From Swiss-Prot, chains A, B:
Reaction it catalyzes: GDP-alpha-D-perosamine + 2-oxoglutarate = GDP-4-dehydro-alpha-D-rhamnose + L-glutamate
Species per Swiss-Prot/TrEMBL record: Caulobacter vibrioides (strain ATCC 19089 / CIP 103742 / CB 15)
Annotated protein name in UniProt: GDP-perosamine synthase
SUPFAM superfamilies per record: PLP-dependent transferases
Gene: per
Recorded family membership: Belongs to the DegT/DnrJ/EryC1 family.
Length: 368, 368
């Protein structure tokens, strides 16, 4: 009865060897060939001109927002249903998160609720691509265009997804990714900013390397950060990136298994809706439990654990947690409902059909 | 003639082994054995109860200040002569750096200039142990206690140093260290906070880990950061620490060669003064050029370079660079003088007596 983990990394390419070179060469810091190579390759992978390697997906967002000039006073629209760093990133800038409702099916920012939230202080919108699925960008871009707003994609959970022929990371003014341990591709901890804007790219690199002038060593023209990725993180990321497609394929296999087995559950869960706008990379396989259940989402998590199956609740809405309770509105209903009923199911490259079978059997038993 | 670099990581212990283990077991993110082991060993090496591993020494500083509650309106006294991360860290809290001059001999915070800088807003004093030498702690602690201020040691360059029987890191309310690539101990990029106070340590672990309750996964009681160290960085760190005494001895030898051979340069340099307060670990061997010279400090660095020898200027005082020029005062004269004539010479564990001979001969050639 081996436990089943919601996530896990699969280092099945050149990771070990590339890490070895770093070690052998003594290039373990924030300078080395893999950083540039990883940035170049990631940039190509997304179809953009620039890729900026960061220490994590959280600092990437911060660094991206600061480079964009988000600061005190400014409002950034962010979905209440998201991972907390989306909101915190805005907060670190001294700026103000303005929460917006999501779609009840895709879990993503509802473009129809944006216009109403725009004010004289709005500067940007941060669509977050939940669970490997790109928000409906066209409408979002169109609203930003109309209001002269920046669009920053939090693409943390979406490496590889596409929207109407474009890869995540290539849609807003800039985008951020995470390579945290459980991500589609990992570096253990690591992040990336993508953009086509030369000027934003330069300011990002300037702020990443402590605010030091790249053309005047030891001289610091602005206040910056230490947000650099190491050559080792870059080594692991490059090797992961080389097998991105294989990694992508493995999740699709796992997802195909859930999808072929779901009737066993009936109307007891609603399977994740796939918008027909491009590839959904399924960082996580997310269901919405039946309101009709006597049991609670939280109990269900406890019961699956008891059956050695790991699962987690969908992100608690920002506005229901202490840091952002004050940002609550009466127009965050869908987010609340998903926060109530949402359940992330184990989705990782190493899960087997038998494991998926176990997961379904347990849900069948616990969904009461 | 290979080039002589000012610093360089000596990975001549178990770094490779420990790292390979992380790769082979897949533990390459911010959870794992090495993290806890490294924190454990480090806390013991410093003689304190807690050590909190972070992704760098700059975020370490930020994290510790936030944990001690530094925020908007507060003032922290920081020497103008330091690496800019010292001041930036306060800046990130939205607090105000209050610059103080240093000793002309040790390059450290001048305790005698502290009191007059204290105001109703002061919350803390940040002594920085430059070049591996601990500031004169007792007088500084004397002033702080009298004014009920916190003390936070920026111990980035002084792992291993001691002061009147105590290791760097055990002296203030908390302290920070850097394992950047050129540091006494390196993890490539890495940092650590040390403290004896249980609650400060807990709050520090709370913030480090995205502000998530260690007791209620997925729940976020406060706004935190992503400042965690990877298991890979901790693995390197632990292997470095296992050989800390050898690393320091190596530097001692090198320093000894300097002490002996520097005679050849006569009054053309002023050798680093060493306080008899405890061990000066010599992150860098720092001279101040003779006033009698006709050459300039920047020119000597260029001439050494052309001769294949790396050196660097003593840090530029904060108040003379754009970000902090607004905090300039007329009582920062020693820091300005040191910045003008200060030169860091190669100092690292891989240097031979011959290498040192070479640096001195080059200095004999360029100090005109
Ligand atoms: O780049 C950093 O984060 C620190 C730089 C530093 O300590 C140095 O160059 O001596
Ligand atoms: Na002179």
């Amino acid at each position: 009865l081996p436990r089943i983990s919601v996530a896990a990394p699969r280092l099945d390419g050149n990771e070990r060897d590339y890490v070895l070179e770093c070690m052998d060469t003594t290039w373990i810091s924030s300078v080395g060939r893999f950083i540039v190579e990883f940035e170049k390759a990631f940039a190509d992978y997304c179809g953009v001109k620039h890729a900026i390697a960061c220490n994590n997906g959280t600092t990437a967002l911060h660094l991206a927002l600061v480079a964009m000039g988000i600061g005190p006073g400014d409002e950034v629209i962010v979905p209440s249903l998201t991972y907390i760093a989306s909101a915190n990133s805005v907060t670190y800038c001294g700026a103000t998160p303005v929460l917006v409702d999501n779609d009840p099916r895709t879990f993503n920012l509802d473009a129809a609720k944006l216009e109403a939230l725009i004010t004289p202080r709005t500067k940007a919108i941060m669509p977050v691509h939940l669970y490997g699925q790109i928000c409906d960008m066209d409408p979002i871009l169109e609203v930003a265009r109309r209001h002269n707003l920046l669009v920053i994609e939090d693409a943390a959970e979406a490496v590889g997804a596409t929207y109407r022929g474009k890869k995540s990371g290539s849609l807003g003014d800039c985008a951020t990714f995470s390579f945290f341990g459980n991500k589609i591709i990992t570096t253990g901890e690591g992040g990336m900013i993508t953009t086509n804007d030369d000027d934003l790219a330069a300011k990002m690199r300037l702020l990443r390397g402590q605010g030091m002038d790249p053309n005047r060593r030891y001289w610091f023209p602005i206040v910056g950060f230490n947000y650099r990725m190491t050559n080792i993180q870059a080594a692991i990321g490059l090797a992961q990136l080389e097998r991105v497609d294989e990694h992508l394929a493995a999740r699709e296999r796992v997802v195909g298994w859930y999808e072929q087995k779901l009737a066993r559950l009936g109307n007891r869960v609603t399977k994740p809706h796939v918008a027909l706008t491009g590839r959904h990379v399924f960082w996580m396989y997310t269901v919405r439990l039946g309101e009709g259940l006597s049991t609670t989402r939280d109990q269900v998590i406890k019961d699956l654990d008891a059956l050695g199956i790991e699962s987690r609740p969908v992100f608690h809405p920002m506005h229901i947690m202490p840091p952002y309770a004050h940002l609550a509105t009466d127009d965050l209903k869908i987010a609340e409902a998903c926060g109530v009923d949402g359940l992330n199911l184990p989705t990782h490259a190493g899960l087997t059909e038998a494991d998926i079978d176990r997961v379904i059997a347990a849900l069948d038993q616990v969904l009461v």
